[PDB]
Amino acid sequence: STGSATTTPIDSLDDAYITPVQIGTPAQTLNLDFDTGSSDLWVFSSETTASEVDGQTIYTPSKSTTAKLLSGATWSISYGDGSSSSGDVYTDTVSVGGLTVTGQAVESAKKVSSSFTEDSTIDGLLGLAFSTLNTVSPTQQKTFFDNAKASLDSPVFTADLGYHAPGTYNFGFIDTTAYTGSITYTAVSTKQGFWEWTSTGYAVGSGTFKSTSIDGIADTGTTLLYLPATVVSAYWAQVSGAKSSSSVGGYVFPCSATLPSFTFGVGSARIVIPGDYIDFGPISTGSSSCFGGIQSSAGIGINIFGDVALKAAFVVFNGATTPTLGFASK
């Protein structure tokens, strides 16, 4: 088996990407945020509070025939920003892209947070992180990828996110048309259950390359590039007028400035994130201050390669016994 699904950004500064997913019988197609930095398949449903659904498409589990309660079974997740969701759990059929997966645990939200309700292009989340992270109780479930993994051609899934355009999520195979050159795979540490790897340095614009090791996760779930303070600051001193602001809570630069490119290490390889991707547009509407896409990891305790650096490469998530992360240039 295999399956390619089109992910299309929800915004004009690409700050999230939704991929359509079919749940039930017959099919209910909800648009889901594919998060490799969580491990929960949750959705906006019919059991979700009515003051808590704005304009989202809902998954009505009493009109899927493959749909059954997992009783006493209960979920509760919290994200890196505040972000909250929770309820009960169903078992049902999920296709992504044609790849069918049967009795997958679909967690059906009874409470969602304010910031999920504000968010009307996203109907729920699909976790593509490691399964020790799954939050269901008292019996822990697995992710799509882990429920499909055995039935797939190669146990792997690619991220190919576009800059201002849609992209693709492929399950089961490497599309060798989708990239330039070689893919460099590097070693992954699965111990905290993240797509966690080790970056071999950085370059800022045309400058010289720094051999330091940056431990990060691959998280398609995060918009921006969260790197340690020394690295991020070496960055922003190349852009004239950029400061750190304690009421925007991060690095801004005026909009008329030319953003130079960020280079990160993949083994002996180099993936250049062009100047253009790091500009997240003006802070408020009207403003001539613009939000930067390289921000400090200091206040979250972990470094994230988010959508800014991932949407610069073709990404292979090798879900083999000894998992690796592969980046190519595109």
Binding site: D15, D33, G37, S78, E118, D219, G221, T222, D307
Partner: peptide, 8 residues
Amino acid sequence: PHPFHXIH
């Protein structure tokens, strides 16, 4: 902008 920080 409305960035995303997808677990805790």
